[PDB]
Design a binder for this molecule. Structure first.
Ligand SMILES: CC[C@@H]1C(=O)N(C)c2cnc(Nc3ccc(C(=O)N[C@H]4CC[C@@H](N5CCN(CC6CC6)CC5)CC4)cc3OC)nc2N1C(C)C
Length: 121
């Protein structure tokens, strides 16, 4: 009984993290490029002229960083992964006026993410 329950837990967490990897690859996949490209790389605040970005956004996040964190064994559960993805979107909505096209793009990518995440075991 104890070994079986222990194995069930290991299997579940592993399946959940494999789903996370599939979702990250889906968001980085090329079918979503039209609205995902602003989230591929960290914001270069100097090139973009955004001297206040780090004052507003205390914990910047982007898909490239999440990928390096996942490749470096840093997510021990799917819920920490999901929190980093949602942070990326939350930062976009906090910094930008809702009428900016980048916010529309975030909403489209977030819908993709949430639809796939809602299917996590
Ligand atoms: C970080 C905040 C938000 C966000 O949440 N994410 C995730 C995000 C991600 N990626 C981007 N990309 C770019 C955004 C913009 C450009 C551009 O050419 N910007 C030009 C506008 C200003 C210009 N200078 C010179 C001329 N000056 C004109 C004089 C009259 C004042 C005005 C100031 C030159 C550069 C290029 C991008 O990438 C190639 N933007 C993002 N935003 C945007 C709202 C900034």
């Amino acid at each position: 009984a104890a070994y079986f329950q222990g194995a069930a837990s290991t299997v579940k967490v592993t399946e959940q993290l494999r789903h996370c990897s599939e979702i990250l690859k889906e968001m980085l996949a090329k079918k979503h490029f039209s609205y995902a490209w602003p989230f591929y790389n960290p914001v270069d605040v100097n090139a973009l002229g955004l001297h206040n970005y780090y004052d507003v956004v205390k914990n910047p996040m982007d898909l490239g960083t999440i990928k390096e964190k996942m490749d470096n064994q840093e997510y021990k559960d799917a819920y920490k992964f999901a929190a980093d993805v949602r942070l990326m979107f939350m930062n976009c909505y906090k910094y930008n006026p809702p009428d900016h096209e980048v916010v529309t793009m975030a909403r489209m990518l977030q819908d993709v993410f949430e639809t796939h995440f809602s299917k996590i075991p």
